[PDB]
Amino acid sequence: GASKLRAVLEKLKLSRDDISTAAGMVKGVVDHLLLRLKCDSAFRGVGLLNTGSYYEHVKISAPNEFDVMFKLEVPRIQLEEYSNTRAYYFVKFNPLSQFLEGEILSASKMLSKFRKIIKEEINDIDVIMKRKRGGSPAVTLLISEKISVDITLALESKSSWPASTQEGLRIQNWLSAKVRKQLRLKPFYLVPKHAKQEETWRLSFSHIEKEILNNHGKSKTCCENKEEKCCRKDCLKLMKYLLEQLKERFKDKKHLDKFSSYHVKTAFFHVCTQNPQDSQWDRKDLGLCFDNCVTYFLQCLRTEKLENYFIPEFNLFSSNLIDKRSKEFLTKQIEYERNNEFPVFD
Numbered sequence: 001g002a003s004k005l006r007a008v009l010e011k012l013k014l015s016r017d018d019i020s021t022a023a024g025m026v027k028g029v030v031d032h033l034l035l036r037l038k039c040d041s042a043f044r045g046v047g048l049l050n051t052g053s054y055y056e057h058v059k060i061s062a063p064n065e066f067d068v069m070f071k072l073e074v075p076r077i078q079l080e081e082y083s084n085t086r087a088y089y090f091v092k093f094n095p096l097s098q099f100l101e102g103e104i105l106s107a108s109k110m111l112s113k114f115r116k117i118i119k120e121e122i123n124d125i126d127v128i129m130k131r132k133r134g135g136s137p138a139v140t141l142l143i144s145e146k147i148s149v150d151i152t153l154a155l156e157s158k159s160s161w162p163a164s165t166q167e168g169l170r171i172q173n174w175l176s177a178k179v180r181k182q183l184r185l186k187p188f189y190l191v192p193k194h195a196k197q198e199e200t201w202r203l204s205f206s207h208i209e210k211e212i213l214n215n216h217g218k219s220k221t222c223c224e225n226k227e228e229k230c231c232r233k234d235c236l237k238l239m240k241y242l243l244e245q246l247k248e249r250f251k252d253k254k255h256l257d258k259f260s261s262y263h264v265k266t267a268f269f270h271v272c273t274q275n276p277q278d279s280q281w282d283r284k285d286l287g288l289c290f291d292n293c294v295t296y297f298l299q300c301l302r303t304e305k306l307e308n309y310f311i312p313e314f315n316l317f318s319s320n321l322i323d324k325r326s327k328e329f330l331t332k333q334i335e336y337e338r339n340n341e342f343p344v345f346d
């Protein structure tokens with residue numbers, strides 16, 4: 001059918017929409033941090049990645065877990081690709097001079113002061129800070145009991161996208177070549193991240209993702225007739241929720257640890273490329289459309305191939321990233337869900 005899936009999406013929608021003081025608590029903390037960082041020599045160009053009043057919830061089942069990004073513009077950037085990894089880069093070349101080690105911008109130093117400044121502002125305020133191996137997210141704050149906020153520091157570059165993206169973002173037959181060109185004129189972001197430990201940064205395009213999801217049809221009027229939607233966004237929510245529920249179901253074992261929403265999002269956008277017509281996403285076909293997505297993700301697990309949507313030579317499912325045993329384990333869980341009308345969805 002398609003009836004149970006609607007009930008799941010309705011539950012998720014009402015949980016997200018219900019009245020809550022959490023966004024206001026998060027806002028007060030964030031505004032406090034931004035004011036403090038702006039009067040520091042290294043962070044005076046810092047600001048929120050998106051200045052909307054609705055915060056980012058990466059975990060679709062967790063309305064008390066917030067994700068925020070602080071962006072810092074860096075003029076005249078020089079990038080050097082690290083170890084042929086396509087997605088990881090040294091930063092070379094002003095205010096960030098204090099973090100150089102040679103010609104190379106040190107992420108770990110920059111995070112240390114970012115953390116320290118945030119640490120000394122938290123005490124000035126019911127907020128607590130936790131350091132855990134990371135840096136993207138750089139800092140996790142906890143507000144009262146339930147509310148948590150991940151803060152990521154990102155560099156912004158307004159120069160052309162790196163060569164590794166030249167053949168990515170293959171939306172030309174879905175969103176048009178005109179739109180691909182406008183999107184590629186937008187800035188790109190870099191977040192501190194190791195590939196496996198050097199001073200490397202990873203390309204981040206979460207603003208492009210958000211723009212496409214809000215203007216996602218082949219037809220420009222897609223989903224504007226509010227009673228005859230497409231089901232693209234619902235399919236992506238369902239895929240996100242499937243992985244989150246399986247990860248929770250098996251938090252005691254380790255096999256699903258390396259999977260994240262990047263993997264589900266990526267597979268979904270490949271199915272959007274595969275199926276560019278809005279008629280392939282009719283809301284009546286929610287169940288069949290979700291099954292296309294599930295089926296494609298399962299093909300990717302079995303072939304151990306999932307190309308990054310922006311950098312096609314980066315294989316998210318390579319065996320050095322996620323080993324065979326872990327991919328084979330997620331395959332069997334998903335095919336049990338698929339064959340039993342998704343028990344995690346009730």
Ligand SMILES: CCCc1cc(=O)n2nc(NCc3ccc(-c4ccccc4)cc3F)nc2[nH]1
Nearest residue numbers: 087203204205206209262265266308309311314
């Ligand atoms: C719209 C499709 C989804 C999407 C959103 C977004 O914001 N971005 N941002 C990049 N940047 C490039 C990039 C990012 C992460 C990883 C990665 C991830 C896990 C493990 C290892 C490596 C590999 C990469 F090549 N890719 C994406 N895809």
Ligand SMILES: [Zn+2]
Nearest residue numbers: 217222223230
């Ligand atoms: Zn639509």
